[PDB]
Amino acid sequence: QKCNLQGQWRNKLGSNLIIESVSQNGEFTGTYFTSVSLIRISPLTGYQKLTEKPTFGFTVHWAFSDSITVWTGQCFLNEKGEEILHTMWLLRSSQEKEQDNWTGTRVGANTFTRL
Amino acid sequence: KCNLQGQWRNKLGSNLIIESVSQNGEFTGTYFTSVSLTNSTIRISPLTGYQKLTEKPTFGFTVHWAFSDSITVWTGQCFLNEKGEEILHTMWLLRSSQEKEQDNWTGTRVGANTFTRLS
Amino acid sequence: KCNLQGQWRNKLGSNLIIESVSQNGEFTGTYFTSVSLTNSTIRISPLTGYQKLTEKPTFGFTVHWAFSDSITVWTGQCFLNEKGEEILHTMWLLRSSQEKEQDNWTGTRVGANTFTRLS
Amino acid sequence: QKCNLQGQWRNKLGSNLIIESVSQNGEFTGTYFTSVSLIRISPLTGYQKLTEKPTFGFTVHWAFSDSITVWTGQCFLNEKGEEILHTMWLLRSSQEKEQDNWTGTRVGANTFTRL
Ligand SMILES: O=C(O)CCCC[C@@H]1SC[C@@H]2NC(=O)N[C@@H]21
Ligand SMILES: O=C(O)CCCC[C@@H]1SC[C@@H]2NC(=O)N[C@@H]21
């Protein structure tokens, strides 16, 4: 356990984060399955650092919606010795007009643990 | 619709280049920041993300800084302004690498930037 | 130092008025927003907050919207620009009232605004 | 238990939030005691809504520091029937120059429970 993000993860909302083999340069791909909404299987792409307790970020391209979410976070080993992802996210909604842009960005935080 | 391809700058003078956009909305490119937290030499850094292929597309991307242990993500939407020029309204989160879990709370900065074409 | 007292506007046309500043940094005033989530009639709403009484003061405040169940908080810093005019750089969180705990995650919007004096 | 914010609260960082009697118009005052830093007793001022499951916000004026934090959130009764504050916050640090403003705002989330 050294925070190679590869594998399946869940958050408290019940969403599933599936991350593939991390490339030599830290790039990864995967799949996001969400139970909440403002059933979707959506692709993601991002990067992780190659260090101990890596930082990372990724974008989910929500299927059948005009929204996008980005997450960024860092992986740590908790007190019980297990890997936890601490994240914060921005959820962008599509606005009809430029003047409505101020309303288009939600923010939040979630922790992921392994399935 | 927008064409996120090409070169953009923000008010800080940072340069965003989107190299290619695929039919699934995925894109790749580079980011050259005019500002940093670190005292290390800034270098061009890679990015990956997605856009919607719609009118006034939303998009998001991650920059994997080549010169620090940080990561930044942006998400935003492209509009045409009054003059009919393309503008990307974005907000971003900058993650710094913390030493221990107990310091996690200090690790995330937030901000906004608007990108335009090079004048 | 800045004098946060008086009238300010942001790029959306919203009007921030700071009525008074006490020696402990506490201030009160009102906010009139040019934009809202609701379709209800916008009305002037009260605010309370604090500034540092330093050069280039940081500050924060909360607006208790009079016409909705939302709350917004801003925090920022005052600088002098190139022309020697006062500017407040802020970021804000807008909390909307959610029906149930399970919807909490949808409840917080974020953004940035800069405020200047009335021209 | 109907989310009158009055009383003592703690978050997972071990900070203490002390909120006084809420006024007729929803305004409140109080005191914030933090264990983390970038011992402080600091004043706060803010407002709560007068509704069920009230939203709220407040500013803490950190003693002996040039920083400010604002929180905004909503109070709910959890599954065990107890009051929880779900919050997000912006922490502003004082920058030396206008050009450094981009680096001055941290963001986060915390949940408070009663002491
Ligand atoms: O110093 C680091 O650790 C990485 C560089 C951070 C650059 C930040 S990220 C958000 C903001 N927008 C930019 O044009 N650059 C900065
Ligand atoms: O509609 C509501 O529920 C309350 C009005 C929200 C106004 C928002 S808060 C942040 C942003 N800055 C402004 O000048 N007004 C909007």
Numbering used by the authors:
A (entry chain A), D (entry chain A): 4 to 41, 46 to 122
B (entry chain D), C (entry chain D): 5 to 123
Provide excerpts from the study:
The amino acids lining the biotin-binding pocket are structurally conserved between xenavidin and chicken avidin. Our results show that xenavidin is a well-conserved member of the avidin protein family having a tetrameric structure, N-glycosylation and extremely tight biotin-binding capability that is mediated via numerous non-covalent interactions including hydrogen bonds, hydrophobic interactions and van der Waals contacts.
Xenavidin overexpressed in insect cells was crystallized with and without D-biotin (BTN) added to the crystallization solution. The subunits of the dimer found in the asymmetric units of the xenavidin crystals are labelled A and D to match the numbering system generally used to describe the biological unit of chicken avidin (tetramer; subunits I-IV;). In the unliganded structure of xenavidin, there was no clear electron density for biotin in subunit A. However, weak electron density was evident for the ligand at the binding site in subunit D; thus, a biotin molecule was built into subunit D of the unliganded xenavidin structure despite the presence of weak electron density around the ligand. In the BTN-complex structure, D-biotin was clearly present in both of the biotin-binding sites of the asymmetric unit. Thus, the unliganded structure of xenavidin may represent the first example of an intermediate structure of the avidin family, with a structural water molecule located deep within the biotin-binding pocket and lending support to the water-bridged model of biotin association/dissociation. Interestingly, N117, the residue analogous to D128 of streptavidin and N118 of avidin, has an altered conformation in unliganded xenavidin compared to N117 of the biotin-complex structure of xenavidin, suggesting a potentially important role for this residue in the water-mediated association/dissociation mechanism of avidins in general.
